[PDB]
Amino acid sequence: DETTYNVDRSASKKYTAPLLDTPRSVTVVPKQVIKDTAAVSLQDALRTVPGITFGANPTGDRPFIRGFDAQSDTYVDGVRDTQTREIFNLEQIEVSKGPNSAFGGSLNLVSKQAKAGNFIDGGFTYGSDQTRRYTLDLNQEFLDGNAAFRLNLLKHDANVAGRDEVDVSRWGVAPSLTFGLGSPTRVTVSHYHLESDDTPDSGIPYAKSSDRSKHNPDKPVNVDRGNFYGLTGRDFQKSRIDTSTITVEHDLTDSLTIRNTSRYGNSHQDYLWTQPDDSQGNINNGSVWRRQNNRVSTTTTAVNQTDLFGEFYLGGFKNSFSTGLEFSREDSKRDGYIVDTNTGLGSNKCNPSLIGAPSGYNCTSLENPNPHDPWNGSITRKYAPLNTVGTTKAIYAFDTIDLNEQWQVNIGARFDSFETTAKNHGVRPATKLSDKSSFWNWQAGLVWKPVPNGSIYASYATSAETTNYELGTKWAFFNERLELSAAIFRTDKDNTQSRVDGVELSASGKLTEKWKVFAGYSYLDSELVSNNGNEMPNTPKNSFSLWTTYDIFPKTTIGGGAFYVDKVYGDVGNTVYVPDYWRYDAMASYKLSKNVDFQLNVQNVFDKKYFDKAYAAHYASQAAGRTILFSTNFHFL
């Protein structure tokens, strides 16, 4: 069933048990939720899972999970990645909220692969924000059903509702080949390519009060909804990602599969954007310094991962296990631009008399900025990069033991070894600095099943310094079409000292035959333990996500979502924040025939102005306003 709102198993076979019986908080955002919400990105899609905030970049692509930074815990099919992620090539999104030695929490993005079946799918979406999105998803068998070819294509252009001039443009191509369908030896080859060229948002500056502190923190200034402080003549955000993956699987016995995966990745970023005022206090006289930020970056990644997984029997118990070796190499080159933003008054100071041409357009108006100002300062590349070469070697082992039909034990360990060399051409003479380290990690879980469709679990994880305790329960109702979850947990971290205590509730699947739900609640009580007693940044204390659809007639579905996010602090010092908000979404779909769907989405039904990322200083990112999307989807199977 491809229309399910509940997914009962992970895709990666490092999990040794179904999700009901896995002793960890895991939420899968299934394909159908991604389609029903009409999500056009990873962040858009993750609004359905509460307590995941993004922070920091001209668009902050760094997730925070249970109040902890997870930029370098994003996986594509269980392997690390070389950046703003699109969803056209994804089947589902797997969110692990606590640790998992198999890989603060992590995201695992499952790619669409060539597989058995013949289909041609495609869609176009037109929007009130000028969205023009075209997708094609073609999968064809060949070699008489022993192999398959799949091609996913994307073209996406859009403005942003309630933001002057800000826009996005991207396209993608994802070819895939799989061989040995149904046989004991399978070979898969994938390539992924995405290129983008955006006009980056400036965001909105924090108010800057004379008495700003932990006690009276500042929030974004209140100005017209569309205000953009950047420059259409200057600012740009260009990226390219290329990823090749080769996977070989062989069944050695009926109980044992060996798997080798090779990934080569290559990503370029060339960004230059504006930040409003960088806390210079010019906003208090009605003006804004257009501070310039930038990054030029190239990264190369090479990974090889060999896994052995399956079953063995010992003392009368089944042991469902996975074990492996991982070797990788990352090359990164960080450079930038040198840009003249001198206002003429102490470099970065402004007032209304300097707005426009007297500041070389480095000052603008707080209330009525002009993004078309013909700014014309020098831009030159530094050509003096920080070049880093990193090596990793890891070994891991995971085992689930069925003691009887009521009791299971999970144990997992992982050892990582790391070597880096950094050459910095930004200082004279250039420096060469090396570093060596390792990371031990292990976890244990206990599952009690009073009845088959019921689960109560304890869990302990440590890494060496971090410690996680979790205690939870999961239940499957209405013929295992509805999963309910509840968890409590504590995370303790030394040399961050910090603590996060929390509660998580989930509901996923069918309530009745016509009524589906995908929903969660998250409570995060976080603390630094002077900043002693402050909340963690990017960690909403309360959040709630509800997505629901109802099959109101045959051929017709209606639906909506309600999302709450509590206030969020930008800094450890708790001096800046973005306020809490409610957002509501609506949808309707009509099956015109077996081959054509029509879909309407209304995002942010009440046109709430709110801020989806709070940065540590200077400013916050404003989310999109009300957006209306009409989709036409074709599918021939």
Author numbering: 27 to 82, 87 to 112, 115 to 135, 142 to 502, 531 to 562, 576 to 608, 625 to 732
Lines quoted from the article behind this entry:
In this Trojan horse approach, the transport of drug conjugates is redirected via TonB-dependent receptors (TBDR), which are involved in the uptake of essential nutrients, including iron. By in silico screening, we further identified a PiuA orthologue, termed PiuD, present in clinical isolates, including strain LESB58. PiuD has a similar crystal structure as PiuA and is involved in the transport of the siderophore-drug conjugates BAL30072, MC-1, and cefiderocol in strain LESB58. An in silico screen identified PiuD in LESB58 and other clinical isolates as a homologue of PiuA, sharing 60% amino acid identity.
Here, we determined the structure of PiuD from strain 39016, which shows 99.6% amino acid identity with PiuD (PALES_48941) from LESB58. The obtained PiuD structure was similar to that of PiuA from PAO1. The crystallographic asymmetric unit has two monomers (denoted A and B). PiuD comprised two domains, a 22-stranded transmembrane β-barrel and an N-terminal plug domain (residues 27 to 156) folded inside the barrel. The plug domain has two β-sheets and two α-helices, which together, occluded the central pore. As often occurs in the TBDR structures, some of the extracellular loops were not experimentally located in the PiuD structure. In the B monomer, these regions, namely, NL1 (83 and 84), NL3 (113 and 114), the loop 138 to 141 of the plug domain, L7 (504 to 530), L8 (564 to 572), and L9 (609 to 624), were presumed to be disordered. As a consequence of the disorder, one side of the extracellular β-barrel was absent. The closest structural relatives were PiuA of A. baumannii (root mean square deviation [RMSD] of 1.1 Å over 701 residues) and P. aeruginosa (1.1 Å over 656 residues) and the pyochelin receptor FptA from P. aeruginosa (1.8 Å over 655 residues). Like PiuA, PiuD also has a distinctive cluster of aromatic and positively charged residues located inside the pore at the extracellular face.
